[PDB]
């Protein structure tokens, strides 16, 4: 049926494409790839999937691929190709609504398209990935996380309602109001439960433009003091964003330059200053406020801070090219062969009672003396802009810092190496982290990751929503 539509593919080409994902470290044939014109042909296969004795396949939703472990892989069984979704010139996939206080999104949309539709009508999503090419869907199984996520919570926190099509083949609709269960378990639920085939997305009016500033630091504990006062509860502060990014003294320059934000004059003043004090790291906190006014409340934020003196450098772009920074980064290392290169990445939440020990473990420790190449991303969350009832998994403190090492790749059997060095040094000091778009291999690594009582509601929600435990078997909880 679906094949004979052409929908269902078995050639070289199609499993082959399906086959590897932006980490480019591991690799695995589906037996079938599923291109959907409608979410109709979603549920004829599910449905099939729940109804059919000795079904053989897993099935993985591949958004646009950007699993760095194989997440988004189904071996042996069918991938299905999420953006045919979006060919059909109509009807729309993406739909502010009438209001404008939220925008639909079909789960295979990548959010710099839910952006552009948003800004025609004036308004935006309040809560971003720092890379707009992924999809509606992939983050939302994840959390979708950002330098606004301190205010206004992970992408999942900004979800009004989804339809989702379970592993039993049916399509539901859900929410707080409706079928919660299910709505908590498929954000952060790592395309467990269902496939998220839209979802109704938060928007604020949009904001024209951006004041960029990124401050320096050789003194990690001012670094940190900064981020969590300007990250803060009042409601929040002025900032819309807050982020950080650190730099080994070993690749400083190149890792300053390649920010994308600092002149070559800016990266020797920065080398300058961490020769004179002979910082062996430096910090730099990246924060907006979106919007003569912009100047005095800059002013007045920025003077409660403890950054390096003449260390603040600024820029202002519309708010369109902030949100899209990552783009040119990628154009240009495209162009030098540079992006589509192996990225053992490792992502965790690291609590903030911990940070200053990871600080001086890793950053300080295990990673000096290397080449580094790809940002070292640090920035503290607010759990209270989570929910503790979804099923992504945060440490336990009122405060904990994302860590974003993204590597990128002989080196590659170094660099997985030093991501078991760091993790070795976390557990040894007992650093109570949790993993973030890593996929763990054992029951016991997952189980610690949920902790019990999530772990068994996730376990709940599964035999519930797929009990044949058929959904994205690339994170290996389940499969
Ligand atoms: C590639 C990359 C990723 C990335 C990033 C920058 C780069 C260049 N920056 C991020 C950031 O700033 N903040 C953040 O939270 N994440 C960031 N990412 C990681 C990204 O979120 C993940 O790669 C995520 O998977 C989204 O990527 P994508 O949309 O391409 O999804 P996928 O990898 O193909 O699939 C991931 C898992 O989710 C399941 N899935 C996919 N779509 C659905 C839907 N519609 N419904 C239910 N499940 C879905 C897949 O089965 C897979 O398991
Ligand atoms: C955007 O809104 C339109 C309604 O105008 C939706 O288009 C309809 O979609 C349903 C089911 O997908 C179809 O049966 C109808 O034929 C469509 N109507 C029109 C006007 O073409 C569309 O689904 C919405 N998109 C999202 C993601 O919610
Ligand atoms: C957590 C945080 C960030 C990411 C990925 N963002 C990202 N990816 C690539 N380049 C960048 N330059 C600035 N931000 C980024 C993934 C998980
Ligand atoms: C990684 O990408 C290269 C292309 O540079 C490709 O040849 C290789 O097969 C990929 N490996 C995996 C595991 O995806
Ligand atoms: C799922 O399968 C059960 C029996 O195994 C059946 O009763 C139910 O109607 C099915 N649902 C769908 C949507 O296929
Ligand atoms: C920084 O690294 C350079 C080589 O890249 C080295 O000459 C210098 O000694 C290092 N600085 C410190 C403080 O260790």
Same mark, same amino acid.
């Given at each position: ?115 552009? /539709?948003?800004?025609? *009508?004036?308004? +935006? !999503? #309040? %809560?971003?990935?720092?890379?707009? @090419? ?90 940190? /003091?900064?981020?969590? *006062?300007?990250? +803060? !509860? #009042? %409601?929040?502060?002025?900032?819309? @964003? ?238």
């Amino acid at each position: 049926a679906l094949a004979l539509d052409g929908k269902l593919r078995t050639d070289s080409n199609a499993t082959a494409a399906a086959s590897t994902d932006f980490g480019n470290i591991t690799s695995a044939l589906p037996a079938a790839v599923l291109y959907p014109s409608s979410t109709g042909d979603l549920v004829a296969l599910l449905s099939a999937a729940n109804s059919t004795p000795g079904w053989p396949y897993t099935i993985a939703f591949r958004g646009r691929g950007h699993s760095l472990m194989g997440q988004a892989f189904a071996p042996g069984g069918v991938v299905v190709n999420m953006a045919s979704l979006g060919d059909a010139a109509a009807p729309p996939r993406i739909n502010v609504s009438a209001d404008g206080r939220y925008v639909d999104a079909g789960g295979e949309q990548v959010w710099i398209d839910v952006l552009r /539709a948003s800004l025609a *009508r004036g308004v +935006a !999503p #309040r %809560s971003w990935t720092d890379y707009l @090419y992924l999809t509606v869907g992939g983050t939302l199984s994840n959390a979708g996380i950002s330098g606004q996520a301190f205010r206004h919570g992970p992408q999942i926190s900004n979800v009004l309602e989804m339809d989702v099509i379970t592993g039993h083949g049916e399509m539901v609709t859900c929410s707080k109001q409706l079928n919660a269960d299910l709505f908590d378990a498929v954000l952060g639920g790592l395309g467990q439960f269902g496939v998220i085939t839209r979802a109704r997305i938060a928007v604020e009016p949009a904001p024209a433009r951006a004041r960029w500033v990124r401050f320096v630091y050789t003194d990690f504990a001012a670094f940190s /003091a900064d981020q969590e *006062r300007l990250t +803060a !509860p #009042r %409601s929040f502060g002025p900032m819309s @964003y807050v982020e950080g990014s650190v730099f080994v003294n070993q690749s400083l320059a190149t890792d300053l330059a390649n920010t994308g934000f600092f002149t070559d004059a800016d990266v020797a003043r920065i080398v300058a200053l961490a020769g004179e004090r002979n910082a062996t790291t430096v910090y730099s906190i990246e924060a907006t406020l979106n919007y003569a006014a912009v100047d005095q409340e800059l002013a007045s934020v920025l003077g409660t801070l403890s950054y390096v003196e003449g260390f603040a450098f600024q820029r202002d772009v519309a708010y369109a090219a902030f949100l899209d920074r990552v783009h040119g980064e990628e154009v240009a290392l495209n162009k030098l062969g540079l992006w589509r290169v192996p990225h053992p990445w490792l992502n965790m939440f690291v609590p903030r009672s911990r940070i200053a020990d990871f600080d001086r473990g890793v950053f300080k420790g295990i990673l000096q003396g290397t080449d580094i190449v790809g940002p070292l991303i640090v920035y503290p969350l607010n759990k209270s802009m989570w929910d503790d009832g979804m099923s992504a998994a945060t440490p336990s403190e009122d405060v904990f810092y994302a860590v974003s090492l993204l590597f990128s790749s002989n080196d590659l059997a170094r660099l997985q190496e030093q991501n078991r060095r760091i993790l070795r040094f976390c557990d040894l000091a007992g650093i109570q982290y949790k993993t973030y778009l890593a996929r763990h291999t054992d029951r016991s690594d997952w189980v610690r990751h949920f902790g019990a009582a999530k772990w068994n509601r996730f376990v709940e929600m599964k035999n519930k929503y797929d009990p044949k435990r058929l959904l994205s078997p690339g994170q290996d909880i389940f499969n």
